[PDB]
Amino acid sequence: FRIAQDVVARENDRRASALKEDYEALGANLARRGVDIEAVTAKVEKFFVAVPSWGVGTGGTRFARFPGTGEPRGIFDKLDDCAVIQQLTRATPNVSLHIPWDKADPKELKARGDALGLGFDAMNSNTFSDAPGQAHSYKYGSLSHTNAATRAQAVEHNLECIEIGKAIGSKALTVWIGDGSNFPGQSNFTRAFERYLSAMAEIYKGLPDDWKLFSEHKMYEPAFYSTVVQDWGTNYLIAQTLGPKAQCLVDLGHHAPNTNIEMIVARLIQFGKLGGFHFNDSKYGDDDLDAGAIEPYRLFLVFNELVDAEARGVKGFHPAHMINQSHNVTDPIESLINSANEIRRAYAQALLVDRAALSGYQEDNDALMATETLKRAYRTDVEPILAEARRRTGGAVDPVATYRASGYRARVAAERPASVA
Amino acid sequence: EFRIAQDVVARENDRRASALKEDYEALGANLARRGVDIEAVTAKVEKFFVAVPSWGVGTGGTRFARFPGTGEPRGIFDKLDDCAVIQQLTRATPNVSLHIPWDKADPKELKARGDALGLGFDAMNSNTFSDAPGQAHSYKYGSLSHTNAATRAQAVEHNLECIEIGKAIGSKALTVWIGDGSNFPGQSNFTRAFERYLSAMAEIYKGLPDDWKLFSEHKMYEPAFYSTVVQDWGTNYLIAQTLGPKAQCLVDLGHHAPNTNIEMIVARLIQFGKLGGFHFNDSKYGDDDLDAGAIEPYRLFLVFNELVDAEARGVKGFHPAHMINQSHNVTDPIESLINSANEIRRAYAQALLVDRAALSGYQEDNDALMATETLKRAYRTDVEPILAEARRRTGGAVDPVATYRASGYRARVAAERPASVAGGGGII
Amino acid sequence: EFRIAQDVVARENDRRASALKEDYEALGANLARRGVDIEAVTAKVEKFFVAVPSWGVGTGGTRFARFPGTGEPRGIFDKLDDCAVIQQLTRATPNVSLHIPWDKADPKELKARGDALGLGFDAMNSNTFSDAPGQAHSYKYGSLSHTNAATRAQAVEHNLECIEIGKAIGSKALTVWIGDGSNFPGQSNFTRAFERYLSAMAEIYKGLPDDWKLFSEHKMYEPAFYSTVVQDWGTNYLIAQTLGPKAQCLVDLGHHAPNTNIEMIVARLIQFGKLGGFHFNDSKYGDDDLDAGAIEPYRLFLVFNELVDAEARGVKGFHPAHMINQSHNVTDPIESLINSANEIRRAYAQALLVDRAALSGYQEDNDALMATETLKRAYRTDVEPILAEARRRTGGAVDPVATYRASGYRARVAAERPA
Amino acid sequence: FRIAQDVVARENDRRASALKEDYEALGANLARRGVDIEAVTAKVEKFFVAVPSWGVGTGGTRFARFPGTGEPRGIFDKLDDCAVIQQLTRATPNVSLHIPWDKADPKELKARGDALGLGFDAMNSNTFSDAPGQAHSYKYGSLSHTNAATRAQAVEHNLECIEIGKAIGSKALTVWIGDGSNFPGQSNFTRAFERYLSAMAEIYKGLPDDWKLFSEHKMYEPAFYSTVVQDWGTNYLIAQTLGPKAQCLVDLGHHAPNTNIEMIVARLIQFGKLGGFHFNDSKYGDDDLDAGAIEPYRLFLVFNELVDAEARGVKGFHPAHMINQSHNVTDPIESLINSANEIRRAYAQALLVDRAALSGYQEDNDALMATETLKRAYRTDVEPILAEARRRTGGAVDPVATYRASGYRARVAAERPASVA
Numbered sequence A, D: 001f002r003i004a005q006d007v008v009a010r011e012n013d014r015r016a017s018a019l020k021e022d023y024e025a026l027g028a029n030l031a032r033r034g035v036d037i038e039a040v041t042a043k044v045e046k047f048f049v050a051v052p053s054w055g056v057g058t059g060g061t062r063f064a065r066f067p068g069t070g071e072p073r074g075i076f077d078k079l080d081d082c083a084v085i086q087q088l089t090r091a092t093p094n095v096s097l098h099i100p101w102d103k104a105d106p107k108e109l110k111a112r113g114d115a116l117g118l119g120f121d122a123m124n125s126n127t128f129s130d131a132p133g134q135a136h137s138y139k140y141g142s143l144s145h146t147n148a149a150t151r152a153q154a155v156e157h158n159l160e161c162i163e164i165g166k167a168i169g170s171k172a173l174t175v176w177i178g179d180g181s182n183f184p185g186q187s188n189f190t191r192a193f194e195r196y197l198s199a200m201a202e203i204y205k206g207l208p209d210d211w212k213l214f215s216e217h218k219m220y221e222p223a224f225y226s227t228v229v230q231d232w233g234t235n236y237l238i239a240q241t242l243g244p245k246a247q248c249l250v251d252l253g254h255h256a257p258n259t260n261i262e263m264i265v266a267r268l269i270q271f272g273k274l275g276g277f278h279f280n281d282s283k284y285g286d287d288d289l290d291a292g293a294i295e296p297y298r299l300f301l302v303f304n305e306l307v308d309a310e311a312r313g314v315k316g317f318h319p320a321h322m323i324n325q326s327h328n329v330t331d332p333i334e335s336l337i338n339s340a341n342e343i344r345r346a347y348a349q350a351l352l353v354d355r356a357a358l359s360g361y362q363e364d365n366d367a368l369m370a371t372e373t374l375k376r377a378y379r380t381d382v383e384p385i386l387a388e389a390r391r392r393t394g395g396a397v398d399p400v401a402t403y404r405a406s407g408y409r410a411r412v413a414a415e416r417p418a419s420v421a
Numbered sequence B: 001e002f003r004i005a006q007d008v009v010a011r012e013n014d015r016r017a018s019a020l021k022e023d024y025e026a027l028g029a030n031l032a033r034r035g036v037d038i039e040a041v042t043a044k045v046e047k048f049f050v051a052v053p054s055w056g057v058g059t060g061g062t063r064f065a066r067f068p069g070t071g072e073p074r075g076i077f078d079k080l081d082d083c084a085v086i087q088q089l090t091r092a093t094p095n096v097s098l099h100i101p102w103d104k105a106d107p108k109e110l111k112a113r114g115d116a117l118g119l120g121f122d123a124m125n126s127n128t129f130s131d132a133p134g135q136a137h138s139y140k141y142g143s144l145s146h147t148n149a150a151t152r153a154q155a156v157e158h159n160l161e162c163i164e165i166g167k168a169i170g171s172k173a174l175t176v177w178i179g180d181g182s183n184f185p186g187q188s189n190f191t192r193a194f195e196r197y198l199s200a201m202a203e204i205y206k207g208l209p210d211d212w213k214l215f216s217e218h219k220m221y222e223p224a225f226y227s228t229v230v231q232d233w234g235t236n237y238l239i240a241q242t243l244g245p246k247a248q249c250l251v252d253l254g255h256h257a258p259n260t261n262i263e264m265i266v267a268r269l270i271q272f273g274k275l276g277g278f279h280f281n282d283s284k285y286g287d288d289d290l291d292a293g294a295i296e297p298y299r300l301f302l303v304f305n306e307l308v309d310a311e312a313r314g315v316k317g318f319h320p321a322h323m324i325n326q327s328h329n330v331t332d333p334i335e336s337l338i339n340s341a342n343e344i345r346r347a348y349a350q351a352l353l354v355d356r357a358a359l360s361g362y363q364e365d366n367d368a369l370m371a372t373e374t375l376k377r378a379y380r381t382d383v384e385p386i387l388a389e390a391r392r393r394t395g396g397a398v399d400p401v402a403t404y405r406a407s408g409y410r411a412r413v414a415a416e417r418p419a420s421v422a423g424g425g426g427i428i
Numbered sequence C: 001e002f003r004i005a006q007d008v009v010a011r012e013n014d015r016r017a018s019a020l021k022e023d024y025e026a027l028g029a030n031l032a033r034r035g036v037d038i039e040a041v042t043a044k045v046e047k048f049f050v051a052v053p054s055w056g057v058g059t060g061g062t063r064f065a066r067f068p069g070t071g072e073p074r075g076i077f078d079k080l081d082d083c084a085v086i087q088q089l090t091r092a093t094p095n096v097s098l099h100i101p102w103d104k105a106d107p108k109e110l111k112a113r114g115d116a117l118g119l120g121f122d123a124m125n126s127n128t129f130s131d132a133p134g135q136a137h138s139y140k141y142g143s144l145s146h147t148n149a150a151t152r153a154q155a156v157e158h159n160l161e162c163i164e165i166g167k168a169i170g171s172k173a174l175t176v177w178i179g180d181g182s183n184f185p186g187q188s189n190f191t192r193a194f195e196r197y198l199s200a201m202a203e204i205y206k207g208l209p210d211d212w213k214l215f216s217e218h219k220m221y222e223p224a225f226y227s228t229v230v231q232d233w234g235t236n237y238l239i240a241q242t243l244g245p246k247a248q249c250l251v252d253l254g255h256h257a258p259n260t261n262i263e264m265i266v267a268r269l270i271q272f273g274k275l276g277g278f279h280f281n282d283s284k285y286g287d288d289d290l291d292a293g294a295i296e297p298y299r300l301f302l303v304f305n306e307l308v309d310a311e312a313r314g315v316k317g318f319h320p321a322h323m324i325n326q327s328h329n330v331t332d333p334i335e336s337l338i339n340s341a342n343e344i345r346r347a348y349a350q351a352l353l354v355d356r357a358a359l360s361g362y363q364e365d366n367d368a369l370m371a372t373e374t375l376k377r378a379y380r381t382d383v384e385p386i387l388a389e390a391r392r393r394t395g396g397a398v399d400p401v402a403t404y405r406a407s408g409y410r411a412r413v414a415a416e417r418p419a
């Protein structure tokens, strides 16, 4: 146990009275609205989102990085920290790895995961940066590089990621690359995309029968003029071209200003290509902020599309969910905790939507009542539900308060040496 | 017929002939030093055409107000007469695009007037984003994707009627742009609305002749301010792919999100054979509908760079339907359309100057600087002499607007047509 | 008088009274646990008012079309009658904002009708962004900043006329929003046009009563699509500062560039004493004019957070004018305004819940996570019971739209008014 | 000379004939337009823009940095490369320094500058990153940090930058900080700004009589929710509050999408607070791409406002122009060369605008002809003017071509050790 059980119990007891009052009050209010709070709590306690191994360390920008104390020294320390997030929130049982950052003996990774009670989600390849001993640089691209040998090298890297994933329990590979151009004319849009498609086809051939390949679009950064996989339109063409095992990953902060992201989600679901999500929040660009910290309603609206899919009876719909954020000015563990909480919060509210009433208002084109129907769900403070779900599953009623009460950060700060060079 | 007296055209051409010859010869020499035959460029420019919107020769407005000018066209016939001026002077707009019901009239007459004016008819445009007098079902909450079956049927019928009018006048395509969408979260179920849209478009597709095309046009927002069914090229692609070989996508420059790389969308659609055509205009904030190239000329060039790259790589079966789609709120509509058509040919001509072999080399070598400089060498070239010479050699005007103003046309039609009144927009 | 039958209000209130009592008491206990007196919050909420736009009572439209509903108001008097319903049910919109010349009519009759309906009048709104019948000079190329002196003079005169009408009905402010700008580079000389605008506004300020305020409203674009004279808050501040103590800036939520941090603009103006007022609405793309809070409710809360913080910091003489400015294109204008007024009070109420002492501590300690969580604890709170009780206690409806629909008001006016 | 004189002469003679033809042809066309090409050329050869010392090194993003060969390390290597840009373009005689990056003995710096034929422009302070041994971290801010000691440290740093500048010939201090927040509530907008103003007042007090203090606004990055100096409105408030010696710096890529930047320039000029403009281009965010490579007309429109003011000589109008870009996929020197070229190109074209005709069309509200009057100047290919100006002043007809013919990059590659072969 990363966090002492007596600490969790103590903090849970300190807040048990208040939780009871709020939960029972919300329960009665929901009952009057025709909703069974127990049914919602039962679903909420089973909603999981993967935690990025690279998210437990402090992030930075191209201008600077300001590390905190006890930064994880490697993947094993990172898994130890991810275990804290899972123990306290019980919403992050799985971790997403990034290769080569997390490269290590698969048997050891697996052993450590099992020991901490953590599993592994989709693998993430890295051909947007150069690793030591690389025969070819990814400066001008990787999977879509003009140089055949460079693409070949990138393909082999992704295949290696699949080999690592198979050994630790992963069932998917997420591919995000920086490929694109910074100047008009630098790249031939079509030829670069064709090159990408050919390389991804090779990677697709390396997929086990029960695996999935997720391509992730991004409007810009690191490429500032054009990006090969720039939006969901190109992403759909990729997935449709590759095959049944290929789907699209939607990262909230990767879209043009004012984009209606929830519609993109609906469109991908309709055509069965919604592979998964990368949750985070933003205001300007790919800010990678704590999910829901900026626009909680938008997050709720994305979940509204996910829940509606269930209501509509969409088959075989199991999108992969992962948090993909950068924590530059907070304790990474605390931000991941509250971010996981916001995601469950939006999910819970989406479950409260009176779909029967909504379908009626949609058919009668009663726009005002249709939107108010969504608002009645979103406006509901579901914190008591999230807290109870945690209490029942061995988590903390107030995760961050319990984390702080445990003195974990100070503990690891004394155990881990900060990098000097 | 000649809306503009030939003597005025000749007079104004001779007046600038000397200067033109000097500039054309200078550019010709420079291009020769660059291994380019100015004549080959001029020859292609003379043959580049862009359709003019019948509704573009009238003064436009916003939801706040409309400030009509003098001699506003009363209907399609006055509009065709004004369009004839644009074609006569620029020689770049031989075809007009009709919008129904605005331009509803006897097909025979339209065709007859067009032939007399030397104008053809491009893509037909349907209108289910507004209600017409005596209309049975309102399009307030949608049309082709409306929840009410009867409303969708009515919209479908309207589009089929547009195809019937087009066949009678020589058109070979239908362009479908609707305002369908929602202003509030929850108001519409994104998927169901799209399913309804797809089903209705399928019915319209069934009414297409074997040599016709059906163009769906995406738009991020307006009139819908929360979600729009056909919101972007992604949804538009799904539409074209689902409907069939005769269905393609139309790209309107000002219908994209801020900072969108529009030239890439063009390339992607060309790659998958779904680039039906373009709707030219410029913008800075939203769907501003400004004069093409008046705000970002380089972007217009970059879009044409993609068009010429395909046109040069022998991309078979590549005949995108180009059209100007603008709103002229503070200029004489005819003058704006004239210079807009000019800017479009300008971007086209400059795209033709690009050393494709050199560019390809720099792309393969990842020489980003030289690759971008290769495009700039073409873009920086002032091709106005080629544009002016092309017009002169084809019966047009060296300086179209100067000739237009010298003719006194606006004053003339102003005397022939009834006066208009300014007013507010649909805001209230 | 009462637009909505008093028996319908009592009926629809009694129908929901039991549930409200349960929700209000539960919220009261929760807030009590948080050291907050729910009664204190409700008291402030029932005192929060926002003006309703006369031009928002009718169905709005776009440059593509207008789809009116039934019983559309024929003029300002019908609009006042409809505004009376909004106030009767929400009790949050006692004042109406007029727009001249759209609402031109005998000022004396307007006041009389207002007094009879229990409505007051907020800031007057001038209109030199469209031409009126018989107008000598067109505003096509601008108004207060038009190159033609006679046109600027005419625009100034119109604004003074707006002040005359306002003085007769009890208005104490003039809001000036114009479309002046250019659609093409070179069309206007940015600086000279602004110099002309400043000179014309100086004339208006000269004729401004000493018990009145003058609000200039910035907008990034529309109707001008290349440049706009009063394009942002920076230019707006220069205007207010140049004109004088009685001149301030009006912030319309949908008038800023994509991704702009609007709440910061609000803070900056307060700090320099130039925040005159707000035009509330919501949006996603441009100046969409949608129901307030319908798209981004947190942003609305964050704007009010700055307003409540101004009081907490001890800023003096801060009494911003609040006004709804929306276009209802696909809903019953009355229902949208009702729920919009409600959303504004909702954001206000939540801002009142922020533990200022705790927040200040987290800010001083740079505890970003707890600071944001402190705002969230307030924002996540469902204050609907407070809003409903406030309405109930002041003669309004527990559920405004439900009571409105039960009254059959729309069908009624649909029969009294043309098609 | 960094570049051999014989190479410059050789590459000039190779292009002299064609240049003669083009220059004469343009001179004739301009003559028919009532314009004297010589008057334009004389002004162009005198238009200078400062080159950033940090611009000659290869740039990167938060994801990766792909260095090229012969990367300059330290201010001395950088000055050596900056000299190349000045010798070939003759448009960048002054270099802008950044402290503590370019820290060195002032006398030695001044000596190296004089030897290379380079002067020194505005000094640039750095409190957006932590230097080793630093007593207080700038993680949560600098000049506006809540901690008094931290603000004092940032103030002292800025004063030290002025001291360094006074010793090498600089006459201004540019202050751009990352200060802001990533979460609502994290900062109190007003108190943070009050702290900033108070700290800047302390810096202002240390300014010599002939020095200027430039504050730079930026919408976002590194702060992703709010930034203290977020736009020109706040920037104007700062300059007006501080005093006559304080002005605002406008960086093209630091504005919200669709912003009309040329108007901001005009407004600042009208109120005498336009301190300078930092050139670069962009399409998405603060891309820091080569000036005019994405939107050359916008660059021309900015210069239209500058030239209109330069013609009349407005009070307080004496801009301190600098290039501020990041070269992630090109030879930094080549990009800086062509960027300086684009800046002079836009300046030259603005010089061609018929102000009298323009003024007329503006007064008559003839929008079409007004915009056409600007286009007639913009559509003019002034390359012959830029090339001749360089030829007459000791520069190269075709800078990049001459640069590549000299083999300079290969030369420094052999003198400077890369991290890896």
Ligand SMILES: OC[C@H]1O[C@@](O)(CO)[C@H](O)[C@@H]1O
Pocket (backbone or CB within 6 Å): A054, A124, A176, A216, A218, A251, A278, A286, A324
């Ligand atoms: O942290 C880098 C990750 O961020 C991205 O979203 C790119 O910004 C990709 O998913 C990468 O894996």
Ligand SMILES: OC[C@H]1O[C@@](O)(CO)[C@H](O)[C@@H]1O
Pocket (backbone or CB within 6 Å): B055, B125, B177, B217, B219, B252, B279, B287, B325
């Ligand atoms: O005038 C409306 C036209 O504008 C559009 O671009 C919609 O904005 C469509 O093409 C319509 O046909």
Ligand SMILES: OC[C@H]1O[C@@](O)(CO)[C@H](O)[C@@H]1O
Pocket (backbone or CB within 6 Å): B427, C055, C125, C177, C217, C219, C252, C279, C287, C325
């Ligand atoms: O309805 C027009 C109003 O909208 C505006 O916000 C302009 O868009 C102004 O405030 C006007 O008064």
Ligand SMILES: OC[C@H]1O[C@@](O)(CO)[C@H](O)[C@@H]1O
Pocket (backbone or CB within 6 Å): D054, D124, D176, D216, D218, D251, D286, D324
């Ligand atoms: O390289 C960092 C420079 O970039 C900036 O524009 C910040 O983006 C500032 O001017 C800094 O000096």
Ligand SMILES: [Mn+2]
Pocket (backbone or CB within 6 Å): A176, A216, A251, A278, A324
């Ligand atoms: Mn991602």
Ligand SMILES: [Mn+2]
Pocket (backbone or CB within 6 Å): A251, A253, A254, A286, A324
């Ligand atoms: Mn990302």
Ligand SMILES: [Mn+2]
Pocket (backbone or CB within 6 Å): B177, B217, B252, B279, B325
């Ligand atoms: Mn269009």
Ligand SMILES: [Mn+2]
Pocket (backbone or CB within 6 Å): B252, B254, B255, B287
């Ligand atoms: Mn359009």
Ligand SMILES: [Mn+2]
Pocket (backbone or CB within 6 Å): C177, C217, C252, C279, C325
């Ligand atoms: Mn407004």
Ligand SMILES: [Mn+2]
Pocket (backbone or CB within 6 Å): C252, C254, C255, C287, C325
């Ligand atoms: Mn508005």
Ligand SMILES: [Mn+2]
Pocket (backbone or CB within 6 Å): D176, D216, D251, D278, D324
């Ligand atoms: Mn800068």
Ligand SMILES: [Mn+2]
Pocket (backbone or CB within 6 Å): D251, D253, D254, D286, D288, D324
């Ligand atoms: Mn910058």
